Design an enzyme around this catalytic site. Structure first.
Site, short mmCIF file in Angstrom:
data_model
loop_
_atom_site.label_atom_id
_atom_site.label_comp_id
_atom_site.label_asym_id
_atom_site.label_seq_id
_atom_site.Cartn_x
_atom_site.Cartn_y
_atom_site.Cartn_z
N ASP A 278 0.84 -1.20 0.00
CA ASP A 278 0.00 0.00 0.00
C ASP A 278 0.88 1.25 0.00
OD1 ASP A 278 0.82 -0.43 2.89
OD2 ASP A 278 -0.37 1.42 3.15
N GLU A 316 -0.33 -0.26 -4.80
CA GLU A 316 -1.15 0.94 -4.87
C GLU A 316 -0.20 2.16 -4.81
OE1 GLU A 316 -2.02 3.20 -1.61
OE2 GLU A 316 -1.96 4.37 -3.48
#
Ligand SMILES: OC[C@H]1O[C@@H]2O[C@H]3[C@H](O)[C@@H](O)[C@@H](O[C@H]4[C@H](O)[C@@H](O)[C@@H](O[C@H]5[C@H](O)[C@@H](O)[C@@H](O[C@H]6[C@H](O)[C@@H](O)[C@@H](O[C@H]7[C@H](O)[C@@H](O)[C@@H](O[C@H]8[C@H](O)[C@@H](O)[C@@H](O[C@H]9[C@H](O)[C@@H](O)[C@@H](O[C@H]1[C@H](O)[C@H]2O)O[C@@H]9CO)O[C@@H]8CO)O[C@@H]7CO)O[C@@H]6CO)O[C@@H]5CO)O[C@@H]4CO)O[C@@H]3CO
EC number: 2.4.1.18
Length: 586
Positions: A278, A316
């Site tokens: 992330d 991401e």
């Protein structure tokens, strides 16, 4: 070997001359005096000191008697002469909270990755991911208690399988002190959280998902330095693990090893099939490029590709760094897949609009195709989109309740047909009304009682998954221009969009969406493969509590030109709906 430091560092079972015990190892270059305080030591730092070898900077000692299951810590005099007790950074299991002692357990047996799980990660595979936070999927009803890893093996795994997902993605199961971080603020990178049971319980969960034919993706958090319980900072009194706001010193060889090690560990010792990183932007930025972060990610990816081929990484990254899912030899970061945040933003803004205004924002649905071939995209409806006053996906939809449900059905139909793998956050499959609450169960009560609109969405997501998996056109060529072609890209006035998905053999599935509540009858458009066509998916079906409008069987094309093509279909397109059609062999 330098890649797998968890095979040497920490607490392992050893055999020094007939007598058994455990060998402890810790890396702390500039401390003076370190002893092992366990349960076997009455917890006395006078009884058991460690001998440092200065070439590696690693303290160590072998303690007979000391067996699996015993709690323990390290008692250290740091560079400054302060007494601090430290948790093993390679703690493979940690004691119940509060508390912070490590548990002697050693390593689980290596898991060999099977051919069918490697196949399940490939670019040509149907990939549909159910994203879950283990702490809030379900609770026991009387007492509100968490489900254990083993209960999750018996309930979550069968549910995901039946719903037709191929992957289960887990918010970070690292040990972490605060439920509210969701796991993104860890304190023990090598121990699965004790919230749901033991490390062997977690392993049983992974095994169960695999026996059900599911791949498992773990959220992996190499970008969030531990900021709680003095767990890693100034580890030996100096800036050992962190840079001299707290962030890892990635360029420092051993630190890098500690992290690449951790990836290899989850994949090799737990059988995890994929990792997701992330917030990549805040690793690589925040000209401001942190060159040590960029090379670390490049490195880690290279190594996984060589060491555990078949496993993949996903990212991401929110600033459009180029080539996040591209090969390092070019400018790339080396990930296999990237979350398509732009697609999530554009399509949700589109669905939020009063249908009457969608004619002016056709751009929002057609843009994704322009950059589709720059990254290997996952289309994500993730946990971040349903918190902090952003609302549920259902509640973003316009109109009265029945129009909301129809908009949401049409949207999933579109999402499942559009190039890119699929990810869906728990709660979305049954159209939860409320936002996600990590401190409660999801709203399963919505599914109690007689058949209702939430059951309708839940059936649709299952049918979408099973249909998407069955037909190669829907998944085989996502990242090849041959896999997709517009048939009607410019019917802005009516907000009708129509395209074709195509497999390697050249078979086409036609995808048509009508994003306004006006039903369209005798809607003619050009096609490529004349003959008989039949719906295989209709989001207005009564089976999902739609109005059951549609084509009612096989439709034959006509030799009537349309949209620069020589043959056409004339179809009914249901209001606020998407349909998929297949060609019938004759
Ligand atoms: O450097 C960053 C990239 O983006 C930049 O693009 C800017 C544009 O140059 C500029 O004009 C403007 O465009 C906006 C426009 O004004 C808006 O209207 C809207 O555009 C919409 C469009 O009107 C709709 O019709 C629809 O488009 C679809 C199209 O109708 C449809 O046929 C199909 O298109 C495919 C074609 O059939 C086919 O020819 C082929 O075209 C290739 C091209 O031949 C090939 O060279 C390929 O290689 C590059 C490309 O040349 C690069 O330019 C690169 O994009 C950058 C631009 O340079 C920037 O200037 O992309 C490719 C790398 O892969 O490029 C084409 C794409 O493959 O394939 C086409 C795609 O399948 O599908 C399209 C899409 O659905 O939808 C549009 C709605 O989004 O939006 C435009 C964006 O604002 O502003 C741009 C700034 O971003």
């Amino acid at each position: 070997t330098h890649l797998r430091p968890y095979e040497t560092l920490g607490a392992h079972a050893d055999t020094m001359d007939g007598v058994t015990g455990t060998r402890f190892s810790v890396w702390a270059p500039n401390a003076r005096r370190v002893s092992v305080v366990g349960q076997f030591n009455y917890w006395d730092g006078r009884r058991h000191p460690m001998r440092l070898r200065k070439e590696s900077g690693i303290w160590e000692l072998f303690i007979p008697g000391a067996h699996n299951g015993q709690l323990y810590k390290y008692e250290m005099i740091d560079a400054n002469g302060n007494l601090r007790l430290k948790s093993d950074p390679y703690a493979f299991e940690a004691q119940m909270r509060p508390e912070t002692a490590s548990l002697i357990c050693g390593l689980p047996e290596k898991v060999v990755q099977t051919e069918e799980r490697k196949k399940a990660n490939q670019f040509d595979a149907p990939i549909s991911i159910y994203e879950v936070h283990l702490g809030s999927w379900r609770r026991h009803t009387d007492n509100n208690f968490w489900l254990s890893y083993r209960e999750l093996a018996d309930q979550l795994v069968p549910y995901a399988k039946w719903m037709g997902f191929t992957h289960l993605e887990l918010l970070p199961i690292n040990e972490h002190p605060f439920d509210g971080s969701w796991g993104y603020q860890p304190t023990g990178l090598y121990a699965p959280t004790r919230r749901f049971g033991t490390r062997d319980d977690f392993r049983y969960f992974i095994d169960a998902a695999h026996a059900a034919g599911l791949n498992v993706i773990l959220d992996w958090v190499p970008g969030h330095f531990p900021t709680d319980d003095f767990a890693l900072a100034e580890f030996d009194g100096t800036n050992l693990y962190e840079h001299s706001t707290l962030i890892y010193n990635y360029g420092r060889r051993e630190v890098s090893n500690f992290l690449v090690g951790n990836a290899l560990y989850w994949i090799e010792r737990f059988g995890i099939d994929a990792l997701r990183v992330d917030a990549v932007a805040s690793m690589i930025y925040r000209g401001r490029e942190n060159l040590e972060a960029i090379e670390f990610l490049r490195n880690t990816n290279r190594i996984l590709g060589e060491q555990v081929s078949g496993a993949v990484t996903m990212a991401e990254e929110s600033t459009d760094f180029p080539g996040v899912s591209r090969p390092q030899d070019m400018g790339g970061l080396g990930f296999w897949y990237k979350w398509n945040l732009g697609w999530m933003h554009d399509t949700l803004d589109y669905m939020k609009l009063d249908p009457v205004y969608r004619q002016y924002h056709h751009d929002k649905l057609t843009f994704g195709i322009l950059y589709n071939y720059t990254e290997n995209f996952v289309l994500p409806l993730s946990h971040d989109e349903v918190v902090h006053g952003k609302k549920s996906i259902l509640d973003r939809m316009p109109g009265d309740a029945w129009q909301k449900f129809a908009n949401l059905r049409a949207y999933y139909g579109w999402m499942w047909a559009f190039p890119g793998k699929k990810l869906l956050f728990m709660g979305n499959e049954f159209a939860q009304g409320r936002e996600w609450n990590h401190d409660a169960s999801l709203d399963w009560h919505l599914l109690e009682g007689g058949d209702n609109w939430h059951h309708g969405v839940q059936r649709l997501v299952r049918d979408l998954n099973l249909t998407y998996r069955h037909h190669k056109a829907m998944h085989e060529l996502d990242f090849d221009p041959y896999g997709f072609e517009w048939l009607v890209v410019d019917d802005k006035e009516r907000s009708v969009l129509i395209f074709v998905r195509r497999d390697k053999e050249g078979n086409e599935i036609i995808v048509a969406s009508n994003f306004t509540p006006v039903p369209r009858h005798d809607y003619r458009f050009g096609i490529n493969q004349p003959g008989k066509w039949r719906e295989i998916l209709n989001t207005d079906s009564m089976h999902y509590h739609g109005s059951n409008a549609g084509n009612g069987g096989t439709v034959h094309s006509d030799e009537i030109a349309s949209h620069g093509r020589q043959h056409s279909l004339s179809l009914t397109l249901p209001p606020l709906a998407t349909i998929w059609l297949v060609r019938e062999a004759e």
